[PDB]
Design a protein around this ligand. Sequence first.
Ligand SMILES: NC(=O)c1ccc[n+]([C@@H]2O[C@H](COP(=O)([O-])OP(=O)(O)OC[C@H]3O[C@@H](n4cnc5c(N)ncnc54)[C@H](OP(=O)(O)O)[C@@H]3O)[C@@H](O)[C@H]2O)c1
Ligand SMILES: Nc1nc(=O)c2nc(CNc3ccc(C(=O)N[C@@H](CCC(=O)O)C(=O)O)cc3)cnc2[nH]1
Ligand SMILES: [Mn+2]
Ligand SMILES: [Mn+2]
Ligand SMILES: [Mn+2]
Length: 159
Amino acid sequence: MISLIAALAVDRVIGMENAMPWNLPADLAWFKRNTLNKPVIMGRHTWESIGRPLPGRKNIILSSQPGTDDRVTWVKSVDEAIAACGDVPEIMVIGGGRVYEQFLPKAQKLYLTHIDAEVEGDTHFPDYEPDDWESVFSEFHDADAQNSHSYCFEILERR
Ligand SMILES: NC(=O)c1ccc[n+]([C@@H]2O[C@H](COP(=O)([O-])OP(=O)(O)OC[C@H]3O[C@@H](n4cnc5c(N)ncnc54)[C@H](OP(=O)(O)O)[C@@H]3O)[C@@H](O)[C@H]2O)c1
Ligand SMILES: Nc1nc(=O)c2nc(CNc3ccc(C(=O)N[C@@H](CCC(=O)O)C(=O)O)cc3)cnc2[nH]1
Ligand SMILES: [Mn+2]
Ligand SMILES: [Mn+2]
Ligand SMILES: [Mn+2]
């Protein structure tokens, strides 16, 4: 099973100048809980944005060019990325925009955080078709001293 996990600001913005400009510790904790002990697939730009391997997860990087770091696994196509995960129950695709586009048709589950924040970005989560997806979990949180915007954790499953 393939799942996508992402945090979206207003208008499905997910990034700006290869960075995420907000800081929402509660959402990063949600990301860690839902990805720990699973393989994570990311594109090369997202690998550069994170800047280090994510511990406790098999890190698989998509790139058309040879890898430059043997602490992670480098693959050259979607099918190779999936194969490199082995026989696991759930593969987590962690972006970015181009990678989300390619894996969305193959995904059964979306873990989405909706952040009530406006930021002028250059990368968006794919337009998906709402009729294809059922909301099975949602949890709203107001802003607090640690998290400066309100946010909503949602899990969608393909109908
Ligand atoms: N808010 C969130 O949830 C979230 C999550 C992830 C990322 N982001 C943000 O998203 C942005 C990065 O997204 P992005 O769309 O620019 O890039 P990306 O999807 O992270 O990376 C794209 C790169 O991945 C490689 N790639 C993708 N598909 C491939 C394929 N089928 N075969 C081989 N290589 C493939 C290519 O690398 P080569 O050029 O080396 O061939 C391509 O240039 C950043 O702003 C980051 O902060 C946000
Ligand atoms: N909901 C969601 N939020 C995100 O921030 C997110 N980020 C990415 C890509 N970028 C990043 C950037 C940093 C870390 C990171 O530092 N993660 C630590 C945080 C642990 C914690 O804060 O408790 C990790 O071990 O996962 C992960 C992904 C992909 N999907 C996402 N999905
Ligand atoms: Mn092929
Ligand atoms: Mn197999
Ligand atoms: Mn806000």
